[PDB]
Amino acid sequence: YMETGDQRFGDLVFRQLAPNVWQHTSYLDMPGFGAVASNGLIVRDGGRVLVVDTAWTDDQTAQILNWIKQEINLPVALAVVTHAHQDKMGGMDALHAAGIATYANALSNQLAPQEGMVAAQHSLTFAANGWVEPATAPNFGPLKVFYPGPGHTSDNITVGIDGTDIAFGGCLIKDSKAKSLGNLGDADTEHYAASARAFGAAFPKASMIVMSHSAPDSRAAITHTARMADKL
């Protein structure tokens, strides 16, 4: 397949990362930071779609689904949400209104309501090696869900996509050229370096790491993240 150009649809941008995979990107102006990109994933598996997180708001999340209707036109079977923050969870209401089953780390679930956000309907749990208990993850298809341990946040979870060299660190992995690890308030600084490495180990073949706030990087984002994290 030939590279097609990145599609502007409403306030959203969609970059195709593979034949079955797209990155959705949405923006919100934060008080001093200007307009802040947030990335997510859309994944076409056979005759159904899977979504990785939401946009900043219920309204942009609705735009995402309209985009899926127009450009793909297959039912969205479910969404997985990688940690609790307005950028990942702020569109839960939109998903619930559309009838879509939502999953999050059991911990993201306990946390969201306090954050003033809507929880996912379903709670994922993980084995000691960090792969999801398959009982709690019905038919996730190509989606491979992994909990590295307490990270940047205690709830961060991550995912790769079978069939591809793609893997999504979310809030955990930072740009290879990053000057800081950013906000450590919910971070576990003892385990942060370990978490970055477990993630890399979990997805050893992944050549494309999709970042929460920036353009997908190579594995260098991981090693760079782990090292910065060893300063703590």
Numbering used by the authors: 38 to 269
Task: Provide the publication's sentences verbatim.
NDM-1 has been reported to be a highly potent carbapenem-hydrolyzing, zinc-dependent MBL. NDM-1 is an extended spectrum zinc dependent β-lactamase capable of hydrolyzing nearly all classes of β-lactams, impairing the ability to treat life-threatening infections with intravenously and orally available carbapenems.. NDM-1 resembles the common β-lactamase fold, although it shows low sequence similarity to β-lactamases deposited in PDB (20–33% sequence identity). Our results show that NDM-1 is unique among other MBLs due to its enlarged and flexible active site, and explain the observed extended spectrum β-lactamase activity.
Three of our apoNDM-1 structures are zinc-free and are the first structures of a wild-type apo-enzyme in subclass B1. The three apoNDM-1 structures include two pairs of monomers A and B and one monomer A, and the structure of monometalated NDM-1 (mZnNDM-1 Δ36NY) includes four monomers (A, B, C, D), respectively in the asymmetric unit, providing nine crystallographically independent views of the molecule for NDM-1 Δ38, NDM-1 Δ36NY (monoclinic), NDM-1 Δ36NY (orthorhombic), mZn-NDM-1 Δ36NY (tetragonal). In our three apo and one monozinc structures, there are nine independent representations of NDM-1 molecules with different crystallization conditions and packing environments. In these structures, most active site loops show very small conformational changes with the exception of ASL1 and to some extent ASL4. These are key loops contributing to the expansion of active site accessibility. ASL1 shows the ability of assuming several alternative conformations that may be important for binding ligands. The structure of zinc-free NDM-1, along with the previously reported structures, provides important insight into the conformational changes associated with the metal binding properties of NDM-1.
